[PDB]
Design a protein around this ligand. Structure first.
Ligand code: HEM
Length: 371
């Protein structure tokens, strides 16, 4: 696990910190009570009433990641506020320096990202109960009725469904170099199987998230400030950085999961020109460095796709296509989500720009079938 891939939860953080050192009890309070400090308005002030606390008292990883989640959740709330059109272009040097320093340690950007607000932002209610929606809960939200539990948790639950496939991958590459056909064939079907499993889990998002509430409320606090005509120049990290600085928002578009399998199955997303590829390449910078590296390792390994074609073996061809189909299925569904949770709400040219981007990626994935 030098790629930080759990056998159980994959790219997620197997059971993150709930509690910070006391030195940072200031930080934990503002964070822990965000529904109230915005719904009141003494958040923006209470952030000003705060020391430039040091980073050094954060001993281990899980601490730094909670610290990133806390500092992250806090930073989104200050900058956006009520999220009604009253924004900051200035961030205090009580927060900017300790968040900017931390986000050089972990080589993440100083913005709330998927890694923070999904992978590191979850808890188990009853330790010795399964991993199901009912028996889990997030660490931090922004407002009430935003359905932050819905989004973060179901996102996470899909990450975990994928873990079941990601642990097969070692087998795939071994079988390939050992020229062990039957093994490889199995391995490929198991991956298809588990990605089919992961789609069912994707359905849960209807059950646990409201469209109007997502689009209206939570979408705002996840949104960053690149090409964002409310901070058109950017956000200023007072103290740390001389100028304003552009960094992009924290979608599930920052996940490693889809990309992981794009690479495994030799789907050249990040090749070609275009904003489709450029986006997908750009997103890797918002993933933990371990995970960036894991994807890089997959690319380095020999091509599954090439192997399969080289063999003249309908069994493999089939199992390969199974995996590809599972991945298209997932994306074809993601689209239905976006329609329901963005397109429709947003009517109550940017709209079709988004969908064409997603359909490009879907299509690229489709184009990789052998059938
Ligand atoms: C209400 C639920 C969801 C909405 C509204 C939504 C919306 C979007 C949007 C608008 C994008 C384009 C990138 C951006 O503008 O940020 C996107 C990309 C993406 N989303 Fe989601 N999403 C949702 C749930 C999920 C979940 C649960 C996953 C995975 C666990 C996921 C995985 C992705 C991925 C991987 C991309 C990058 C494009 C790709 O590789 O296919 N999304 N999503």
């Amino acid at each position: 696990k030098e790629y930080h891939i759990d056998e159980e939860v994959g790219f997620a953080l197997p059971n993150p910190q709930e509690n910070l050192p006391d030195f940072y009890n200031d930080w934990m309070f503002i964070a822990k009570h965000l529904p109230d400090l915005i719904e009141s308005g003494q958040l923006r002030e209470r952030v000003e009433k705060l020391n430039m606390l040091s980073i050094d008292h954060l001993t281990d990883h899980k601490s730094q990641r909670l610290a990133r989640l806390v500092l992250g959740c806090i930073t989104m709330a200050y900058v956006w506020g009520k999220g009604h059109g009253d924004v900051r272009k200035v961030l205090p040097r009580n927060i900017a320096v300790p968040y900017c320093q931390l986000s050089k340690k972990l080589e993440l950007p100083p913005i709330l990202v998927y890694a923070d607000c999904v992978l590191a932002n979850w808890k188990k209610k009853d330790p010795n109960k399964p991993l199901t929606y009912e028996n889990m809960d997030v660490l931090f939200s922004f407002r009430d009725g935003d359905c932050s539990k819905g989004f973060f948790l179901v996102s996470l639950l899909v990450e975990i469904a994928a873990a079941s496939a990601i642990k097969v991958i070692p087998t795939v590459f071994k079988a390939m170099q050992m020229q062990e056909r039957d093994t490889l064939l199995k391995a490929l079907l198991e991956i298809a199987s588990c990605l089919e499993k992961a789609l069912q889990v994707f359905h849960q998002i209807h059950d646990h998230v409201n469209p109007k509430a997502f689009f209206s409320v939570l979408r705002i606090y996840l949104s960053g400030w690149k090409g964002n005509p409310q901070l058109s120049d950017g956000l200023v990290y007072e103290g740390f950085w001389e100028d304003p600085k552009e960094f992009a928002g924290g979608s599930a578009g920052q996940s490693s999961v889809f990309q992981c399998f794009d690479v495994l199955l030799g789907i050249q997303q990040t090749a070609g020109g275009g904003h489709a590829a450029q986006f997908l390449q750009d997103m890797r910078r918002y993933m933990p460095p371990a995970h960036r590296n894991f994807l890089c390792s997959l690319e380095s390994n020999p091509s599954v796709r090439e192997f399969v074609l080289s063999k003249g073996d309908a069994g493999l061809r089939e199992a390969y296509d199974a995996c590809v189909k599972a991945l298209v299925s997932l994306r074809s569904y993601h689209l239905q989500i976006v329609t329901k949770y963005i397109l429709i709400p947003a009517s109550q040219t940017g709209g079709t720009d988004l969908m064409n981007f997603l359909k490009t990626v879907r299509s690229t994935t489709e184009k990789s079938l052998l059938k």
